[PDB]
Amino acid sequence: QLSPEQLGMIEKLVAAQQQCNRRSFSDRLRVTPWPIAPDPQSREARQQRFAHFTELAIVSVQEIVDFAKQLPGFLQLSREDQIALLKTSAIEVMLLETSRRYNPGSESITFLKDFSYNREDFAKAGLQVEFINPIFEFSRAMNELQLNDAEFALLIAISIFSADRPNVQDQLQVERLQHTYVEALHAYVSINHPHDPLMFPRMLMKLVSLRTLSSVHSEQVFALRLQDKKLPPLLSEIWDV
Amino acid sequence: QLSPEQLGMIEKLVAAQQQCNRRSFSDRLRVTPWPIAPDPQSREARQQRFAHFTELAIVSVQEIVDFAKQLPGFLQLSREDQIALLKTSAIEVMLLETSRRYNPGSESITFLKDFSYNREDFAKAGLQVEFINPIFEFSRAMNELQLNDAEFALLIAISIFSADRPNVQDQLQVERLQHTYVEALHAYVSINHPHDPLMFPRMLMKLVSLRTLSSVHSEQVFALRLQDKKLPPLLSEIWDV
Amino acid sequence: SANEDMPVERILEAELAVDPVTNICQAADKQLFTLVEWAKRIPHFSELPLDDQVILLRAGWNELLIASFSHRSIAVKDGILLATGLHVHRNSAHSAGVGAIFDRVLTELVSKMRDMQMDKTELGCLRAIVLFNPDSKGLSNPAEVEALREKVYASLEAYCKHKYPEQPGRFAKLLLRLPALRSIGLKCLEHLFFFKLDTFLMEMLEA
Amino acid sequence: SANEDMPVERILEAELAVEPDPVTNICQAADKQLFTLVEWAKRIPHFSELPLDDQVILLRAGWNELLIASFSHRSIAVKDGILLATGLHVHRNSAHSAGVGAIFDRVLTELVSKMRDMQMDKTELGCLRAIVLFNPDSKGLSNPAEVEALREKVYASLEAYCKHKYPEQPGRFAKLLLRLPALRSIGLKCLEDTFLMEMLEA
């Protein structure tokens, strides 16, 4: 079963996501606008789409940091461990949040309510198909799961508390923290999907997929260097290094 | 015009190929037959198709060694260099000889006049699309070049006499030997394609494509290990280790 | 009925049926042959189209071998025991340039397997999970592979509830070794160049 | 006109515009030079007229051979070693100790030494790199035919250039081209008995 303690914790997580995200929404004008330029061979237009996308990403990372800070146990880690956890889980959480915003009907992804994009939009910014396609496939697949706010929030917490990240010092404590969310998610899905006990394993296996997607992402990062399309300081720090 | 020596050397290369090939042909009846079995899921039928193909490759390798021994200067190299050149050039010559046997109309390849196969036939033997497709594309492109017998023979010798193969000791001599054929080839284009000089660089650049194809082959060789599809002793010697 | 659809007994039978860097590569070379032997003994694998079987093995070979030698090395001190009886120690590893990844196998795989006493049956099931990966390209029918993977989830959980009744989270603990195995597998595959190739985050955390 | 279709003067200017453990340092040097690729390519005649997407595809496929060729030529003076873009020298001894002596030596003998020996000039280096760049065989090109056309224009321009600049070396064009198979095998590498003897004795 789920204890009141556990139901409270889940509520806190979900409320934190809502809080963090409302802060993102009102930051939305900081993002370089999407160009209306009519010419697919315009290099300036391309750069501006890339500026727009990388700036959206920065908002995402900001939201992810704000969220982690509210996870019980996170701020009790050394700063080195907080940084080791966030640096490598950012792309994974960003992927989960993205799948959350995938529309199967138009096959598009919508950020901050007003910015909707399909595969061709992402390619018009210079992103390669072997980055785009797997992410759309991940999104569709996640979309199929039909997870609710509680289940995303826990899966996000489980992803963040991954002790095998490079440079984690206190692995014991990170696993102990992760185990809380794992146990909670398990009780949650057995209670809320009583006729689908496979939902639990399906979800944990998404953590495996995120590893592949993280490697795909790193290959896109490199590909960007080849075009000399430079990442913003924050993104460069967490990914170029 | 071509010097008497270049003409004699070319006649010799062409004669050597015709003679070596007539011997191969005398062995066509010895080859394990292509399977008759109707069952795409039959492992036994797949293995038999693989056996047929590996047996053909041996015939090809036999011809290549036989032709190499006719190359002026080849037998004057050490046995070690002879072996170094043959082990690594074998796949390239096999590809060149396969490209001469490509039928643009049926998009098929025919060995020994009687054994014709399309892309699907090769897949039916368990070969991978990453291997099959580049070879068909190379074959199609070579076919379009419309080289004659002298031009193939020269390119084969040039490929064989590549000083940069692994384990080549007398590199300077191998280069000096290759130089004789390259010059002959250039003379041959100047005389026999007087209004199409681009034929020369086009032919030489095929030597580059062959390096990539060789890598593609090496990858297919590994994939065979994954399926424990054993190569016969000769083929294993030159490609496994 | 979960076990009947994917007998952990067959999966066990499948497992029982089968430079320091140079040593390791020779060890992998040796075991490559075992892969089809093992896979054919995994329930229903042989019923997939032949092309699909090749694809799954081609996709999972490294994680499959890594998992195998990790569980084999549970007895070793600071290294691994290759399929060729040879030992590779941490030191030898670091001196050859592959210290980080070697260390990662030791902590995330070997020791975790030791600590929880992962059994051969559990190992076998995890490998079947690795094997039945529906996401690889070119699969004739992915749904079918996905279906079999899920039969392994069901069968393994059942196995863990019955064999380790007073460890309710052991199943989850087994699956949670897979993310690490995937990351390690990818590292071991990445080629030379990429293999060998702070302030703003601290700022945000501190704000 | 061969030159007018693909001017070597421009190719030279492209090259000139982008002048300035061992394995890690070699990698860091490569990383430093990545940004030079679009800067160099945009000055190769007609490259900029290709679809943006094709441009990306050519650079992604060619990057490692393009860089290897550049440092090789830069290393022509250095004895038994290479000169990295970071100014570091890597000697072959240090390369063998680091366990990449085979590939390193291959670079010295097939590329650096051959460039030094024939006195490959910068125009010729640029043209060979242009040939590497305009590779119509990479997957995903919107129009391979156009890329192939450009490559042949380098063939004609480069050959014309060799006949005029080195009239007493009729083999020179072919000689430059014959470096490309070695470059391709090296570039591929950087990205990763009894029965024969008996056949030879028959």
Ligand SMILES: O=C(O)Cn1ccc2c(OCCCN(Cc3cccc(C(F)(F)F)c3Cl)CC(c3ccccc3)c3ccccc3)cccc21
């Ligand atoms: O929308 C909200 O409510 C909150 N929010 C605001 C921005 C926001 C967000 O930013 C998206 C920026 C778009 N993304 C930009 C981006 C993200 C990560 C790395 C890079 C790269 F490295 F520069 F390539 C980029 Cl350009 C691309 C997006 C994607 C989706 C589908 C196909 C291709 C690319 C993506 C998403 C997740 C991981 C990797 C790639 C992701 C998730 C939630 C977000």
Ligand SMILES: O=C(O)Cn1ccc2c(OCCCN(Cc3cccc(C(F)(F)F)c3Cl)CC(c3ccccc3)c3ccccc3)cccc21
């Ligand atoms: O026909 C003649 O007169 C002479 N002759 C007889 C056999 C013969 C010949 O044998 C071909 C056997 C078929 N081939 C067998 C083979 C060749 C090389 C490596 C392997 C492998 F390693 F086992 F994979 C195989 Cl099975 C495959 C063939 C091919 C063609 C198109 C798509 C995929 C594969 C091939 C050919 C050359 C290089 C690589 C692959 C090739 C060329 C001339 C020949």
Ligand SMILES: CC1=C(/C=C/C(C)=C\C=C\C(C)=C\C(=O)O)C(C)(C)CCC1
């Ligand atoms: C782990 C590891 C590596 C290779 C792992 C691979 C590819 C599997 C080995 C198979 C064995 C060793 C099987 C066995 O003995 O049973 C590399 C080369 C990167 C170096 C050291 C870290």
Ligand SMILES: CC1=C(/C=C/C(C)=C\C=C\C(C)=C\C(=O)O)C(C)(C)CCC1
């Ligand atoms: C050749 C070589 C390698 C890769 C070289 C590549 C692909 C990049 C070189 C760019 C440089 C060195 C640029 C410069 O300094 O101008 C590896 C890593 C396999 C190590 C052995 C030597």
